[PDB]
């Protein structure tokens, strides 16, 4: 059919043949084609997830306004996301919680139950959310502002991210991507409220390889010089994301934790403790190795689960991912796209008309 104003028509119902739009195809900076065609169903899954992502974010940009609580923004975004991705257990759904980190906080912040935070006119909000089909995760994010005073900061980071995307490729050394991203990032200077800053990358934050049902596969893409010389390989999927800040350029754990994720390497652990055993079963059935938040547990009817959750974390079965913020008073911005290192080319599968 044809998608409605407020999204409601699943992406699979808009492409009856099962073939989904490709993202932007670029050349790296027959045989290799047969190989590409061999994993076509995989690429296709990534695309379906991206189309869901592109329509969801365009919807968000249409109504996100200061005055709304952070919980309303996330629940409205997630509702639409579940609809378009046509959530089906672990076969299709949300890959991780809706990040909406504010101001000096760069990532991993999503409201828990009872959070009364309200989006403000001067807020710099990072919307980071993902969708997946068969575990093929699409990690893509953008920054939201209402005050044009951040325009230059946003452009700086957007330009740095697209620079990282362009420098990415097969045999490209990872430290060369980080060196490039920083050089562009620091080529920007901004003025916010009578003070000037040279945008700086958040050195302890970075891009990452993506694996099936594993948001952070194992390889990291730095956004500053001095990284590993490890190379990007053929067929890998990468999340290219950069963060710009007017602070120290370093983030630290802060505020209450809302993000949690099962340790991908841990195996079966028999638990006799009633509540802890139940919570783990719920995580395995609903999220598997995909990240989740406390709101997604409340949603499923769970209550009195914090202690059980803490046990799982203490056991090393679940890992907490608290908000990562720069110093108080600073501003941070982010832009992220997922790219596929296909044999015949480089596809920025999450690319949209928006960014
Ligand atoms: C490990 C972990 C937990 C929660 C969210 C992310 C994330 C979001 N965008 N990129 N990475 C990663
Ligand atoms: Co992300
Ligand atoms: Co990411």
Secondary structure of 224-274 in HEC code, one letter for each residue: CCCCCCCECCCCCEEEEEEEEECCCCCCEECCCCCEEEECCCCCCCCCCCH
3-state helix, strand, coil in the chain (%, to 5): 30, 30, 40
Q: In the structure, which protein residues have their CB atom closer than 6 angstroms to any atom of ligand 1? A: 96, 99, 108, 128, 139, 215-216, 239, 259, 261, 291, 321
User: Which ligand places an atom closest to the C-alpha of 95?
Assistant: 1
CA distance 80 to 244: 29
Q: Over the Cα atoms of the chain, what is R_g? A: 20
Residues whose CB is less than 8 angstroms from the CB of residue 37 and which lie 6 or more positions away in sequence, other chains included: none
Both tokens assigned to 34: 């047969």
CA distance 349 to 48: 10
Residues whose CB is less than 8 angstroms from the CB of residue 5 and which lie 6 or more positions away in sequence, other chains included: none
Both tokens assigned to 65: 């306004």
Distance 98 CA to ligand 2 centre (A): 9
**Alpha helix ranges (H) inside the chain:** 31-38, 40-63, 70-85, 151-167, 174-185, 274-286, 294-299, 306-315
| Ramachandran angles phi, psi of 341, nearest 5° | -90, 70
- Annotated binding residue 216: yes
CA distance 33 to 141: 30
* Ligand 1 atom at minimal distance to the Cα of residue 261: 3
Tell me which residue has tokens 């740095």. Answer: 160
Q: Structure solved using which method?
A: X-ray
Both tokens assigned to 28: 């790296």
Both tokens assigned to 153: 């900061």
CA distance 244 to 163: 14
- Annotated binding residue 132: no
| Ramachandran angles phi, psi of 308, nearest 5° | -60, -45
Residues whose CB is less than 8 angstroms from the CB of residue 285 and which lie 6 or more positions away in sequence, other chains included: none
| Resolution for the entry shown, Å | 1.9
Checking phi first, is residue 218 left (phi over 0); if not, alpha (psi -120 to 50) or beta? left
* Ligand 1 atom at minimal distance to the Cα of residue 216: 1
CA distance 182 to 179: 5
Q: Which residues are catalytic?
A: 128, 139, 208, 216, 241, 336
Burial class (CB in 10 A: 0-12, 13-18, 19+), 191: exposed
- Please give the domain boundaries of the chain with CATH numbers for all domains: 41-248+328-351 (3.90.230.10), 249-327 (1.10.10.10)
Q: Are 1 and 11 in contact (CB under 8 A)?
A: no
- Annotated binding residue 45: no
CA distance 262 to 158: 31
């Amino acid at each position: 059919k044809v998608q409605t104003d407020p999204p409601s028509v699943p992406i699979c119902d808009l492409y009856p043949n099962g073939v989904f739009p490709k993202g932007q195809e670029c050349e790296y900076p027959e045989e290799k084609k047969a190989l590409d065609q061999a994993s076509e169903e995989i690429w296709n899954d990534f695309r379906e997830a991206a189309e869901a992502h592109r329509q969801v974010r365009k919807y968000v940009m249409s109504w996100i306004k200061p005055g709304m609580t952070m919980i309303e923004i996330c629940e409205k975004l997630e509702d639409c996301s579940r609809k378009l991705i046509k959530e089906n257990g672990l076969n299709a759904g949300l890959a991780f919680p809706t990040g909406c980190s504010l101001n000096n906080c760069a990532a991993h912040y999503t409201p828990n139950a009872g959070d009364t935070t309200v989006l403000q006119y001067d807020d710099i909000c990072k919307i980071d959310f993902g969708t997946h089909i068969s575990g093929r995760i699409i990690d893509c994010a953008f920054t939201v502002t209402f005050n044009p005073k951040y325009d230059t900061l946003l452009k700086a980071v957007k330009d740095a991210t697209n620079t990282g995307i362009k420098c990415a490729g097969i045999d490209v050394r990872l430290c060369d991507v980080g060196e490039a991203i920083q050089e562009v990032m620091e080529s920007y200077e901004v003025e916010i409220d009578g003070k000037t800053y040279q945008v700086k990358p958040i050195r302890n934050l970075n891009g990452h390889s993506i694996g099936q049902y594993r948001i952070h596969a194992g390889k990291t893409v730095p956004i500053i010089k001095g990284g590993e010389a490890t190379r990007m390989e053929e067929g890998e999927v990468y999340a290219i994301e950069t963060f710009g800040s007017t602070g120290k350029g370093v983030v630290h754990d802060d505020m209450e934790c809302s993000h949690y994720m099962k340790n991908f390497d841990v195996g079966h652990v028999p638990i006799r403790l009633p509540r802890t055993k139940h919570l783990l079963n719920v995580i395995n059935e609903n999220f598997g190795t995909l990240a989740f938040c406390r709101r997604w547990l409340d949603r499923l009817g769970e209550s009195k689960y914090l202690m059980a959750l803490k046990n799982l974390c203490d056991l090393g079965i679940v890992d907490p991912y608290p908000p990562l913020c720069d110093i108080k008073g600073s501003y941070t911005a982010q832009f992220e796209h997922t790219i596929l290192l296909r044999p015949t080319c480089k596809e920025v599968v999450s690319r949209g008309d928006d960014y």
